[PDB]
Short mmCIF file of C-alpha atoms and ligand atoms in Angstrom, two decimals:
data_model
loop_
_atom_site.label_atom_id
_atom_site.label_comp_id
_atom_site.label_asym_id
_atom_site.label_seq_id
_atom_site.Cartn_x
_atom_site.Cartn_y
_atom_site.Cartn_z
CA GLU A 1 0.00 0.00 0.00
CA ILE A 2 1.42 3.39 -1.08
CA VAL A 3 1.04 5.81 1.83
CA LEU A 4 0.62 9.49 0.80
CA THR A 5 1.63 12.05 3.41
CA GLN A 6 0.40 15.54 2.91
CA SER A 7 2.14 18.53 4.38
CA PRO A 8 1.64 20.87 6.11
CA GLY A 9 -1.60 19.83 7.89
CA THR A 10 -2.88 23.44 7.71
CA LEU A 11 -1.51 26.29 5.55
CA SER A 12 -2.52 29.74 7.04
CA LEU A 13 -2.53 32.34 4.28
CA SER A 14 -4.18 35.45 2.90
CA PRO A 15 -5.67 36.19 -0.63
CA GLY A 16 -2.98 37.15 -3.17
CA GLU A 17 -0.35 34.89 -1.50
CA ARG A 18 1.22 31.74 -3.04
CA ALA A 19 0.18 28.35 -1.57
CA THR A 20 2.63 25.36 -1.79
CA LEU A 21 1.10 22.02 -0.83
CA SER A 22 3.20 18.84 -0.66
CA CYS A 23 2.40 15.16 -1.15
CA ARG A 24 5.06 12.56 -0.36
CA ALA A 25 4.68 8.87 -1.26
CA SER A 26 6.14 5.94 0.75
CA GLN A 27 7.08 4.32 -2.62
CA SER A 28 7.57 5.75 -6.14
CA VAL A 29 4.14 6.46 -7.78
CA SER A 30 3.58 4.46 -11.02
CA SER A 31 3.78 6.74 -14.15
CA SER A 32 3.00 9.94 -12.15
CA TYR A 33 -0.68 8.70 -11.82
CA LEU A 34 -1.19 11.43 -9.19
CA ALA A 35 -4.28 13.61 -8.79
CA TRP A 36 -5.11 16.70 -6.71
CA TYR A 37 -8.63 17.59 -5.55
CA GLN A 38 -10.27 20.55 -3.85
CA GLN A 39 -13.19 20.08 -1.45
CA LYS A 40 -15.44 22.82 -0.02
CA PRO A 41 -17.89 22.18 2.94
CA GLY A 42 -21.09 20.38 1.83
CA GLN A 43 -19.69 19.74 -1.68
CA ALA A 44 -18.26 16.69 -3.46
CA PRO A 45 -14.45 16.96 -4.23
CA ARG A 46 -13.41 18.56 -7.52
CA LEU A 47 -10.52 17.36 -9.70
CA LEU A 48 -7.84 20.06 -10.06
CA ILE A 49 -4.81 18.14 -11.51
CA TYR A 50 -4.43 14.65 -13.03
CA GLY A 51 -1.22 12.89 -14.22
CA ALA A 52 0.76 15.04 -11.67
CA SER A 53 0.93 18.15 -13.93
CA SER A 54 -2.24 18.32 -16.16
CA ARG A 55 -4.92 20.87 -15.25
CA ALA A 56 -8.51 19.46 -15.33
CA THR A 57 -10.97 21.18 -17.76
CA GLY A 58 -12.43 24.34 -16.25
CA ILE A 59 -9.62 24.75 -13.65
CA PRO A 60 -8.00 28.26 -13.42
CA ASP A 61 -4.33 28.81 -14.53
CA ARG A 62 -3.26 29.76 -10.93
CA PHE A 63 -3.45 26.01 -10.03
CA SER A 64 -0.42 23.97 -11.14
CA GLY A 65 0.97 20.53 -10.34
CA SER A 66 4.51 19.16 -10.42
CA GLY A 67 6.74 16.36 -9.22
CA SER A 68 7.26 12.66 -9.87
CA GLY A 69 8.10 9.43 -8.09
CA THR A 70 7.82 10.07 -4.36
CA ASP A 71 7.46 13.91 -4.26
CA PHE A 72 4.52 15.98 -5.59
CA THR A 73 3.52 19.59 -5.23
CA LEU A 74 0.34 21.59 -5.86
CA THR A 75 0.98 25.33 -6.29
CA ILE A 76 -1.73 28.03 -6.16
CA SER A 77 0.22 31.05 -7.52
CA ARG A 78 -2.07 33.85 -6.10
CA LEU A 79 -4.84 32.76 -3.72
CA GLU A 80 -8.42 33.90 -4.42
CA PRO A 81 -11.07 33.91 -1.55
CA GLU A 82 -12.74 30.82 -3.21
CA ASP A 83 -9.44 28.85 -2.79
CA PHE A 84 -9.76 28.52 1.01
CA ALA A 85 -10.73 24.84 1.23
CA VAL A 86 -9.34 21.30 1.84
CA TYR A 87 -6.97 19.76 -0.70
CA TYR A 88 -6.24 16.04 -1.21
CA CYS A 89 -3.69 14.10 -3.28
CA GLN A 90 -4.47 10.61 -4.59
CA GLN A 91 -2.46 7.97 -6.49
CA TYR A 92 -4.34 5.86 -9.03
CA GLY A 93 -1.51 3.78 -10.48
CA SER A 94 -1.70 0.75 -8.17
CA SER A 95 -4.29 -0.85 -5.91
CA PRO A 96 -5.27 -0.02 -3.16
CA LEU A 97 -5.91 3.50 -4.42
CA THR A 98 -5.01 5.89 -1.63
CA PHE A 99 -5.70 9.48 -0.74
CA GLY A 100 -3.49 11.70 1.35
CA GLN A 101 -5.00 12.84 4.68
CA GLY A 102 -5.66 16.37 3.31
CA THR A 103 -4.26 19.90 3.76
CA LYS A 104 -6.57 22.71 4.87
CA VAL A 105 -5.72 26.17 3.45
CA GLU A 106 -7.16 28.57 6.07
CA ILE A 107 -7.75 32.33 6.17
CA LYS A 108 -4.93 34.06 8.04
CA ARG A 109 -5.93 36.97 10.31
CA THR A 110 -4.41 38.84 13.29
CA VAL A 111 -4.00 37.07 16.68
CA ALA A 112 -7.14 37.31 18.89
CA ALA A 113 -7.05 35.96 22.44
CA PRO A 114 -10.09 33.85 23.47
CA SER A 115 -12.71 35.15 25.92
CA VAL A 116 -13.00 32.31 28.52
CA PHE A 117 -16.21 31.20 30.23
CA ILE A 118 -16.93 28.34 32.65
CA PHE A 119 -20.32 26.65 33.24
CA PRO A 120 -20.88 24.56 36.39
CA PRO A 121 -23.24 21.53 36.00
CA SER A 122 -26.88 22.62 36.28
CA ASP A 123 -29.21 20.93 38.82
CA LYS A 124 -31.18 19.54 35.87
CA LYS A 125 -27.93 17.97 34.48
CA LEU A 126 -26.92 16.69 37.99
CA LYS A 127 -30.43 15.12 38.40
CA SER A 128 -29.58 12.98 35.31
CA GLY A 129 -26.59 11.53 37.33
CA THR A 130 -23.86 13.31 35.26
CA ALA A 131 -21.70 16.39 35.93
CA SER A 132 -20.63 18.09 32.70
CA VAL A 133 -18.39 21.11 33.32
CA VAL A 134 -18.11 23.27 30.24
CA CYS A 135 -15.29 25.66 29.41
CA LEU A 136 -15.92 27.93 26.40
CA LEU A 137 -13.09 29.65 24.48
CA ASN A 138 -14.70 32.29 22.25
CA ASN A 139 -13.56 34.09 19.05
CA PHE A 140 -9.88 33.25 19.00
CA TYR A 141 -7.11 33.05 16.38
CA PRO A 142 -4.94 31.02 15.65
CA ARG A 143 -6.61 27.61 16.13
CA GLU A 144 -3.84 26.30 18.49
CA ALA A 145 -5.18 26.52 22.08
CA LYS A 146 -4.48 24.47 25.21
CA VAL A 147 -7.22 23.77 27.81
CA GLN A 148 -6.15 22.25 31.15
CA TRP A 149 -8.74 21.03 33.64
CA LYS A 150 -7.81 21.13 37.32
CA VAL A 151 -9.91 19.50 40.07
CA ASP A 152 -8.76 20.57 43.59
CA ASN A 153 -5.54 21.75 41.76
CA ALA A 154 -4.83 18.19 40.40
CA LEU A 155 -4.21 18.20 36.63
CA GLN A 156 -6.91 16.23 34.76
CA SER A 157 -6.40 13.73 31.92
CA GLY A 158 -8.68 11.40 29.90
CA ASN A 159 -11.99 12.77 31.26
CA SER A 160 -12.68 15.66 28.82
CA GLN A 161 -13.79 16.20 25.18
CA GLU A 162 -13.14 19.17 22.89
CA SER A 163 -15.31 20.54 20.06
CA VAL A 164 -14.28 23.38 17.70
CA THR A 165 -16.35 25.43 15.22
CA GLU A 166 -15.24 26.04 11.63
CA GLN A 167 -13.56 29.43 11.03
CA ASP A 168 -16.19 32.24 11.32
CA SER A 169 -17.25 33.57 7.84
CA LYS A 170 -17.32 37.21 9.14
CA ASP A 171 -14.33 37.50 11.58
CA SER A 172 -12.22 34.36 10.64
CA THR A 173 -11.94 33.24 14.33
CA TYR A 174 -12.57 29.88 16.08
CA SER A 175 -14.58 28.96 19.15
CA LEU A 176 -13.94 25.81 21.23
CA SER A 177 -15.98 23.98 23.86
CA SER A 178 -14.13 21.72 26.35
CA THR A 179 -16.38 19.49 28.50
CA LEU A 180 -15.05 17.83 31.71
CA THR A 181 -17.29 14.78 32.36
CA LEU A 182 -17.58 13.14 35.80
CA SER A 183 -20.36 11.02 37.36
CA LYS A 184 -22.54 12.97 39.90
CA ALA A 185 -21.05 10.80 42.77
CA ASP A 186 -17.46 11.53 41.63
CA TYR A 187 -18.22 15.28 41.13
CA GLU A 188 -19.46 15.48 44.78
CA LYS A 189 -16.06 14.22 46.07
CA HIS A 190 -14.24 17.43 44.94
CA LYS A 191 -14.57 21.18 45.64
CA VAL A 192 -12.56 23.39 43.16
CA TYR A 193 -13.19 23.05 39.38
CA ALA A 194 -10.90 25.06 37.09
CA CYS A 195 -10.30 25.55 33.38
CA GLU A 196 -6.77 26.90 32.51
CA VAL A 197 -6.40 28.30 28.97
CA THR A 198 -3.07 28.87 27.09
CA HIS A 199 -3.00 30.80 23.79
CA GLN A 200 -0.65 33.11 21.78
CA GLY A 201 -3.08 36.02 22.38
CA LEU A 202 -2.79 35.62 26.19
CA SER A 203 0.34 37.11 27.91
CA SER A 204 -0.12 34.42 30.66
CA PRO A 205 -2.68 31.49 31.04
CA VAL A 206 -6.28 32.48 31.92
CA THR A 207 -8.11 30.54 34.64
CA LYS A 208 -11.85 30.41 35.24
CA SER A 209 -12.94 28.45 38.32
CA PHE A 210 -15.80 27.77 40.74
CA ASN A 211 -16.46 25.88 43.98
CA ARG A 212 -19.01 23.06 43.71
CA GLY A 213 -22.34 24.18 45.26
CA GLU A 214 -21.56 27.93 45.27
CA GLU B 1 -23.79 16.25 -19.80
CA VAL B 2 -22.07 13.70 -17.48
CA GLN B 3 -24.25 12.77 -14.47
CA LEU B 4 -23.80 10.30 -11.57
CA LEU B 5 -26.80 9.87 -9.24
CA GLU B 6 -26.35 7.81 -6.05
CA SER B 7 -29.20 6.11 -4.21
CA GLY B 8 -29.70 3.48 -1.47
CA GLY B 9 -28.34 5.34 1.55
CA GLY B 10 -30.03 5.57 4.94
CA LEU B 11 -30.14 4.19 8.49
CA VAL B 12 -28.97 0.61 8.99
CA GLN B 13 -27.94 -1.52 11.99
CA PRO B 14 -24.49 -3.19 12.51
CA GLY B 15 -24.35 -6.64 10.91
CA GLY B 16 -26.99 -5.43 8.40
CA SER B 17 -26.92 -5.11 4.57
CA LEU B 18 -27.38 -2.20 2.21
CA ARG B 19 -27.05 -1.91 -1.57
CA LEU B 20 -26.02 1.42 -3.04
CA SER B 21 -26.58 2.18 -6.69
CA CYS B 22 -25.25 4.85 -9.04
CA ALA B 23 -27.13 5.62 -12.26
CA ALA B 24 -24.76 7.12 -14.86
CA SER B 25 -25.63 9.17 -17.97
CA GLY B 26 -23.82 11.40 -20.51
CA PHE B 27 -20.98 9.01 -21.45
CA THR B 28 -20.20 5.48 -22.71
CA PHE B 29 -20.37 3.87 -19.22
CA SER B 30 -18.52 0.63 -20.22
CA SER B 31 -15.46 2.68 -21.38
CA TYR B 32 -14.64 3.82 -17.81
CA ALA B 33 -13.50 2.22 -14.58
CA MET B 34 -15.79 3.36 -11.70
CA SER B 35 -15.07 3.81 -7.97
CA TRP B 36 -16.79 4.25 -4.60
CA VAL B 37 -15.15 6.77 -2.24
CA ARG B 38 -16.45 7.48 1.25
CA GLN B 39 -16.08 10.30 3.75
CA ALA B 40 -16.88 9.84 7.47
CA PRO B 41 -18.48 12.97 9.07
CA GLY B 42 -15.72 15.58 9.59
CA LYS B 43 -13.00 13.28 8.15
CA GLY B 44 -10.93 12.78 4.97
CA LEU B 45 -11.69 10.95 1.73
CA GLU B 46 -11.27 7.16 1.88
CA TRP B 47 -11.15 5.08 -1.33
CA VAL B 48 -13.43 1.97 -0.97
CA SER B 49 -13.57 0.01 -4.20
CA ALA B 50 -12.93 0.17 -7.93
CA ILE B 51 -14.16 -1.83 -10.95
CA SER B 52 -12.80 -1.95 -14.57
CA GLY B 53 -15.01 -0.91 -17.57
CA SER B 54 -15.89 -4.58 -18.31
CA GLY B 55 -16.42 -5.55 -14.65
CA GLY B 56 -13.73 -8.26 -15.00
CA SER B 57 -11.49 -6.68 -12.36
CA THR B 58 -12.60 -5.51 -8.87
CA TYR B 59 -10.42 -3.74 -6.24
CA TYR B 60 -11.06 -3.14 -2.50
CA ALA B 61 -9.59 -1.16 0.38
CA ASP B 62 -8.38 -3.61 3.15
CA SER B 63 -11.04 -2.13 5.56
CA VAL B 64 -13.95 -3.41 3.37
CA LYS B 65 -12.35 -6.64 1.89
CA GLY B 66 -14.64 -9.68 2.26
CA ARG B 67 -17.67 -7.55 3.27
CA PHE B 68 -18.35 -5.23 0.27
CA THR B 69 -18.85 -6.21 -3.41
CA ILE B 70 -18.65 -3.74 -6.25
CA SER B 71 -20.48 -4.61 -9.48
CA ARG B 72 -21.83 -2.96 -12.59
CA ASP B 73 -24.65 -3.59 -15.06
CA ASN B 74 -23.31 -2.18 -18.35
CA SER B 75 -26.67 -2.81 -20.14
CA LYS B 76 -28.30 -0.46 -17.49
CA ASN B 77 -25.43 2.13 -16.95
CA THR B 78 -25.54 1.35 -13.23
CA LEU B 79 -22.74 0.87 -10.69
CA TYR B 80 -23.48 -1.00 -7.42
CA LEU B 81 -21.88 -1.51 -4.01
CA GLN B 82 -23.29 -4.46 -2.04
CA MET B 83 -22.38 -3.68 1.59
CA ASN B 84 -22.68 -6.66 4.05
CA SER B 85 -21.68 -7.14 7.73
CA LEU B 86 -21.93 -3.34 8.25
CA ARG B 87 -20.09 -1.73 11.20
CA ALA B 88 -20.52 1.67 12.93
CA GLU B 89 -17.14 2.72 11.28
CA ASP B 90 -18.76 2.36 7.78
CA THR B 91 -20.87 5.47 8.58
CA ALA B 92 -20.05 7.96 5.82
CA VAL B 93 -21.21 9.78 2.74
CA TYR B 94 -20.65 7.37 -0.19
CA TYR B 95 -19.62 8.91 -3.55
CA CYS B 96 -19.80 7.31 -6.97
CA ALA B 97 -16.70 8.54 -8.97
CA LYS B 98 -15.80 8.21 -12.66
CA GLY B 99 -12.44 7.08 -14.08
CA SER B 100 -8.75 7.23 -13.00
CA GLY B 101 -8.22 10.71 -11.53
CA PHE B 102 -11.90 11.29 -10.65
CA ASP B 103 -13.18 14.00 -13.00
CA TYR B 104 -16.84 13.41 -12.09
CA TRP B 105 -18.35 12.64 -8.69
CA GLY B 106 -21.96 12.05 -7.68
CA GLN B 107 -23.54 14.20 -4.92
CA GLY B 108 -23.11 11.34 -2.42
CA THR B 109 -25.49 9.21 -0.35
CA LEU B 110 -25.36 9.09 3.45
CA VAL B 111 -25.07 5.72 5.19
CA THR B 112 -25.49 5.62 9.01
CA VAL B 113 -24.69 2.28 10.69
CA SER B 114 -25.88 2.26 14.25
CA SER B 115 -27.57 0.06 16.81
CA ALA B 116 -29.36 3.18 18.20
CA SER B 117 -33.14 3.74 17.68
CA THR B 118 -34.44 7.20 16.66
CA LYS B 119 -34.66 9.37 19.78
CA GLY B 120 -35.28 13.07 20.48
CA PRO B 121 -32.85 15.17 22.56
CA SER B 122 -32.44 16.11 26.27
CA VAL B 123 -31.69 19.86 26.65
CA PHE B 124 -29.70 21.42 29.54
CA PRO B 125 -29.26 25.17 29.89
CA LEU B 126 -25.77 26.69 30.36
CA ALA B 127 -26.84 29.60 32.57
CA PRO B 128 -24.95 32.96 32.50
CA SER B 129 -23.26 33.96 35.80
CA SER B 130 -20.13 35.85 37.02
CA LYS B 131 -18.17 32.68 35.91
CA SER B 132 -19.30 33.27 32.29
CA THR B 133 -18.93 37.11 32.24
CA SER B 134 -15.83 38.38 30.34
CA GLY B 135 -15.82 42.19 30.78
CA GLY B 136 -19.20 43.54 29.67
CA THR B 137 -20.10 40.34 27.72
CA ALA B 138 -21.83 37.24 29.13
CA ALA B 139 -21.92 33.76 27.54
CA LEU B 140 -24.92 31.43 27.75
CA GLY B 141 -25.89 28.24 26.00
CA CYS B 142 -27.69 24.91 25.76
CA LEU B 143 -26.29 21.36 25.86
CA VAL B 144 -28.25 19.16 23.38
CA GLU B 145 -27.76 15.47 24.11
CA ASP B 146 -28.88 11.87 23.75
CA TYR B 147 -30.39 12.19 20.24
CA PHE B 148 -30.31 10.02 17.13
CA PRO B 149 -29.89 10.36 14.16
CA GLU B 150 -28.29 13.66 13.14
CA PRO B 151 -29.24 16.51 12.74
CA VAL B 152 -30.77 18.76 15.38
CA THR B 153 -31.23 22.41 14.52
CA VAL B 154 -30.72 25.00 17.23
CA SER B 155 -32.01 28.58 17.05
CA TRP B 156 -32.12 31.34 19.64
CA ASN B 157 -35.29 33.42 20.30
CA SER B 158 -37.03 31.69 17.29
CA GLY B 159 -34.30 32.99 14.94
CA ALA B 160 -34.36 36.65 16.14
CA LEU B 161 -30.96 36.17 17.88
CA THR B 162 -28.20 35.20 15.36
CA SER B 163 -25.25 37.52 16.25
CA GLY B 164 -22.51 35.77 18.29
CA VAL B 165 -24.21 32.34 18.12
CA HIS B 166 -21.86 29.32 17.84
CA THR B 167 -23.29 25.83 17.45
CA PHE B 168 -20.66 23.14 17.82
CA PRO B 169 -20.43 19.97 15.68
CA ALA B 170 -22.17 16.88 17.14
CA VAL B 171 -20.07 14.26 18.89
CA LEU B 172 -21.05 10.60 18.73
CA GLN B 173 -21.11 9.09 22.27
CA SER B 174 -20.55 5.38 23.31
CA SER B 175 -24.38 5.12 23.67
CA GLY B 176 -24.70 5.59 19.88
CA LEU B 177 -26.35 8.93 20.65
CA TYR B 178 -25.12 12.40 19.70
CA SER B 179 -24.45 15.52 21.72
CA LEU B 180 -23.63 19.14 20.92
CA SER B 181 -23.77 22.57 22.43
CA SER B 182 -24.91 25.97 21.20
CA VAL B 183 -23.61 29.13 22.81
CA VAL B 184 -24.20 32.85 22.42
CA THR B 185 -22.43 35.94 23.77
CA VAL B 186 -24.61 38.94 24.74
CA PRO B 187 -24.20 42.25 26.63
CA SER B 188 -24.06 41.42 30.35
CA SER B 189 -26.45 44.43 30.84
CA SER B 190 -29.19 42.57 28.90
CA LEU B 191 -29.51 39.72 31.52
CA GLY B 192 -32.89 39.75 33.30
CA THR B 193 -34.22 42.27 30.70
CA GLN B 194 -33.85 40.17 27.48
CA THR B 195 -35.29 36.65 27.56
CA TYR B 196 -32.97 33.98 26.01
CA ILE B 197 -34.59 30.76 24.77
CA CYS B 198 -32.85 28.06 22.79
CA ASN B 199 -35.19 26.25 20.36
CA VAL B 200 -34.15 22.72 19.61
CA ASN B 201 -35.76 20.91 16.68
CA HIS B 202 -35.19 17.22 15.90
CA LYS B 203 -37.14 16.36 12.75
CA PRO B 204 -36.29 12.57 12.71
CA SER B 205 -38.11 12.07 16.04
CA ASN B 206 -40.79 14.79 15.43
CA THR B 207 -39.68 16.52 18.68
CA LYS B 208 -39.07 20.18 19.50
CA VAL B 209 -37.88 21.69 22.77
CA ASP B 210 -37.69 25.25 24.06
CA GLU B 211 -35.33 25.96 27.01
CA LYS B 212 -35.44 29.38 28.69
CA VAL B 213 -31.86 30.16 29.84
CA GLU B 214 -32.07 31.98 33.19
CA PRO B 215 -29.20 34.03 34.73
CA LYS B 216 -27.52 32.79 37.95
CA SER B 217 -25.82 34.74 40.84
NA1 NA C 301 6.50 17.69 -1.84
NA1 NA C 302 -14.09 6.40 6.14
NA1 NA C 303 -20.75 -8.14 -0.58
NA1 NA C 304 -17.31 -9.76 -8.17
NA1 NA C 305 -19.99 -6.49 -12.64
#
């Protein structure tokens, strides 16, 4: 099985800038049978390049493909707002046909620190036998953000889930929800619940905390 | 004009069977190899199976080998994918794709493999308080849980409140049920003056919930 590794995972850029996307194969790709696709949310993928360097019909000149063997590149010479999407490489020379894991080209904007909010479990939620503690990080950029849960100052691991929104269409920021999940009985054994947030926009980590029952 | 129209998708249980079909038009069908490509919700493209123009050669990803069968009826311009012994991990949008370097794709057909039965959500308010007040802004929300299948729609004040609303993607839980949250930031001065209600609609179960989000001290 030919493994295709796409790099970087995310390319943060602005319109007018050049995008360089890489695709590296674990073994040499048979007769440059390499394709590039673009995919927008809620749409099927669209062929951009086939045979490593041939532009598909209807594809703008700004898109160009190159490389051979183990190393391929997709170049977008001058980004247009419609080019912010997910890009995949695929080899079709030998079975199993494989896709790369994708590269997202995201809208670059200025750094914005998150606004941090904490939500203690409601009585209605506790009545269900579960304590969900929610920490909200709102309108931040870049996407990289660290959330640390602390219960009576002990660092938490393996008992939380994170969800992130897609980049906002108007301000290009992200929002993230981190939920600490404990059983009601376990939640009642501890007093101090804290969410510690680390981000480029913050000069030092921001903590939001509460005491159970207050 | 080249057209690929998928059908046969829907809700199915693990261990169950489903047959997807793709009706092709606008080209000599038998002259092209055809593939099935799937995409799990929020994930990347995964190649599933390919078949030559004649149907004499079939190819499968290791993850579907022995369970799925690709076939074609060249006298009917139809591509098929017989999916047996279905697993929760087979949940995805399934695309019909033409050729080698897929120049045409169908719109896709959603397949949801789950042992869960259709169920409406439980709604829990995320009340605003001093703990969710950043400066002169307060955050409030609603946790929407234990529902199946996707989607739920969440609106605030019957659609009158749209500014600063963030509805998070659903997360599949071990129960086979989904959960999400919807939040909104508002002026902290509006609390106790402006009423905030999250309206949760779950069409598959014919259920709708309103939850008035009340400020705390
Ligand atoms: Na490269
Ligand atoms: Na998949
Ligand atoms: Na089969
Ligand atoms: Na066969
Ligand atoms: Na066949």
